[PDB]
Design a protein around this ligand. Structure first.
Ligand SMILES: CNC(=O)[C@H]1Cc2ccc(NS(=O)(=O)O)cc2CN1C(=O)OC(C)(C)C
Ligand SMILES: [Cl-]
Ligand SMILES: [Cl-]
Ligand SMILES: [Cl-]
Ligand SMILES: [Cl-]
Ligand SMILES: [Cl-]
Ligand SMILES: [Mg+2]
Length: 297
């Protein structure tokens, strides 16, 4: 049981050792496509690649490759697409993937510039009147509106397939205060934002999988998806004790390497899940309290 386990690990001071064991046990599958010479400039990080079995394929002829993985959680019945922050030359592929996979939401857990460097291309329009055309993929993207809170911004985007003229609303949930290789400021701020994504409907099984990215699409992204699936699992069963966090993380790691990048992101994951369980088991009030503690205004 996660809370018993949590205190035990904290008491013994062994998050590092628990975390390294997950890395030692983690799946190792091939990434032959990611490593083809022709795809070198489609990858942000040499040592962060999608496994071939789980990679999202673009529906070109030409080159179907994008650094993106379908994390398909069978028992939870939720899927997520995890991806790197798109590069200047892969922004059209990124929106092409959103369109073909029928995603309704994109969750971005990084900033475009972190520690003085460009960790993600500016892949969405910052101004209504200056829309983006991705000519390679025949798509157009327009900012419709935004709601800026203290530490996250929600945008409404309209994506248009120029070849068909069909349009879709995409919601963009941008967490702007989660440091690279870091943890959110509190369980409350992370959970306030996670429940905003949930409330939008973007995770409904009537849509394609939500797109989740940070810079590499593994650390902050893994943390977000792990907390969510753990909460979903206990919500389905109404049974917090039936969730094994480390087993869930190992299962997700069958679909993409490196998910959760530090022992403190692991420990933060347990914090978020232990706290969010209050909500799941019927303590209505904690949602307002998270919103307050997060200081979103
Ligand atoms: C340590 N650093 C690294 O391993 C790499 C890969 C990574 C993997 C994961 C990652 N975290 S996250 O997935 O964005 O939370 C950030 C980075 C940033 N990196 C880098 O900036 O390293 C580069 C490629 C820029 C030299
Ligand atoms: Cl930004
Ligand atoms: Cl900076
Ligand atoms: Cl970039
Ligand atoms: Cl940072
Ligand atoms: Cl790792
Ligand atoms: Mg304006």
């Amino acid at each position: 049981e996660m809370e018993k386990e949590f205190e035990q690990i904290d008491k013994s001071g062994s998050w590092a050792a628990i975390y390294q064991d997950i890395r030692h046990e983690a799946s190792d599958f091939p990434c032959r496509v990611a490593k083809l010479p022709k795809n070198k400039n489609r990858n942000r990080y040499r040592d962060v690649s999608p496994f071939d079995h789980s990679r999202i394929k673009l529906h070109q002829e030409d080159n179907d490759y994008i650094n993106a993985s379908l994390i398909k959680m069978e028992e939870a019945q939720r899927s997520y697409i995890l991806t790197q922050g798109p590069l200047p030359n892969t922004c059209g592929h990124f929106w092409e993937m959103v369109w073909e996979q029928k995603s309704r939401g994109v969750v971005m857990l990084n900033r475009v510039m972190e520690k003085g460097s460009l960790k993600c291309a500016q892949y969405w329009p910052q101004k209504e009147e200056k829309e983006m055309i991705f000519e390679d993929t025949n798509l157009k993207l327009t900012l419709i509106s935004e709601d800026i809170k203290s530490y996250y911004t929600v945008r409404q985007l309209e994506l248009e397939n120029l070849t068909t003229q069909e349009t879709r609303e995409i919601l963009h949930f941008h967490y702007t205060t989660w440091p690279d290789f870091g943890v959110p400021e509190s369980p409350a701020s992370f959970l306030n934002f996670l429940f905003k994504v949930r409330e939008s409907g973007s995770l409904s099984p009537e849509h394609g999988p939500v797109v989740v990215h940070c810079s590499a699409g593994i650390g902050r992204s893994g943390t977000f998806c792990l907390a969510d699936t753990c909460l979903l699992l206990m919500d389905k069963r109404k049974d917090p004790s039936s969730v094994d966090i480390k087993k869930v993380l190992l299962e997700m790691r069958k679909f993409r390497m490196g998910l959760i990048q530090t022992a403190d992101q692991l420990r933060f994951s347990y914090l978020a899940v232990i706290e969010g369980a209050k909500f799941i088991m019927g303590d209505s009030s904690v949602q307002d309290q998270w919103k307050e503690l997060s200081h979103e205004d």
